[PDB]
Design a protein around this nucleic acid. Structure first.
Lengths: 179, 179
DNA sequence: TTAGGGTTAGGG
DNA sequence: TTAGGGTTAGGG
């Protein structure tokens, strides 16, 4: 079994009335939780408006995310795969995006190669293989845009992927302003 | 005089036809350049669509920025105070925003203290001193929003500022998702 | 060398 | 202790 970090969801935008009890009761519909916490101001004990749930298996996490949208105590919340504390301070660590950078694919990787690899993770809206506008050559990287952020979030938990005969690398796609 | 880094403008969105010669001819309207470069791909020599100019003094940089918008070889460009290479990899290093975070101002700093200190850098739109919503207590930081990004860019070239008798710290303002 | 995009972070 | 905002990044 994977360690808890890979079975854990960040639950954003909680109603300030939601409690560990009501958060647990909601996410238990997809399986047993090994942890559940609503984060609170230590001084006032007021809710900070988010928390975490940790399922007993990866399959349970996926089932919960497959059943979005989630409404708890009368507010629609935003569950996300938990980004590890060690990523704090990295550009884009907590940005939610639908686009993935793929590097290391050299000059023989075409759009369909990326599609064949990534389509099992989720619905793909577009793929871009970057080329040099003057030489025409492939530049050895591309982007995959999904219809939802969750495939990106899951994919980037594994940095290195074997694609089209290459040791490729994935990164969450960041705009110029974010990089 | 100041080091070149503080006399330097990043010029974003260049026409791909702009050359060092045409970039220089444009910016020399405001003073003599000690440096001018159009950045290119090392393999193909295609323009990357940006460059730098460095003026002989800080006053000349200010004069150029006071004369925006700038159009060069038929394209409107975006000049920006240059962000040092050493900032690469920090969240928000290259963000362009009108809003400034001000920390370290404790519980006795009011809007007018920030207005009095910052108004010399440019036109101020709004000032917010942040308080705890329930208690009303000042939380020791605030935000200054200007009508343009350039005052922010200039201000954050100096991290530490004395404000209302405090050692304060300034940061470009980021959304929570970017931190 | 593996950060685009007509979206804009560094050569010498 | 110095990251807001009904704006959502961690305590045990």
């Amino acid at each position: 079994r994977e360690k808890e970090q890979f079975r854990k969801l960040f639950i954003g935008g909680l109603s300030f009335e939601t409690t560990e009890e009501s958060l647990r009761n909601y996410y238990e519909q997809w399986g047993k939780l090994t942890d559940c916490v609503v984060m609170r101001d230590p001084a006032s004990k007021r809710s900070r408006g988010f928390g975490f749930v940790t399922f007993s298996s990866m399959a349970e996490v996926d089932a919960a995310m497959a059943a979005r949208p989630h409404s708890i105590d009368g507010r629609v919340v935003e569950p996300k795969r938990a980004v590890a504390r060690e990523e704090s301070g990295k550009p884009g660590a907590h940005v939610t995006v639908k686009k993935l950078f793929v590097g290391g694919i050299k000059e023989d990787t075409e759009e369909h190669h990326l599609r064949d690899y990534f389509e099992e993770y989720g619905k793909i809206d577009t793929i871009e293989i970057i080329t040099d506008r003057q030489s025409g050559k492939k530049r050895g990287f591309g982007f995959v845009t999904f219809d939802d952020h969750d495939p990106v979030d899951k994919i980037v938990l594994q940095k290195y992927h074997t694609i089209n005969g290459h040791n490729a690398e994935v990164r969450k796609a960041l705009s110029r302003q974010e990089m």
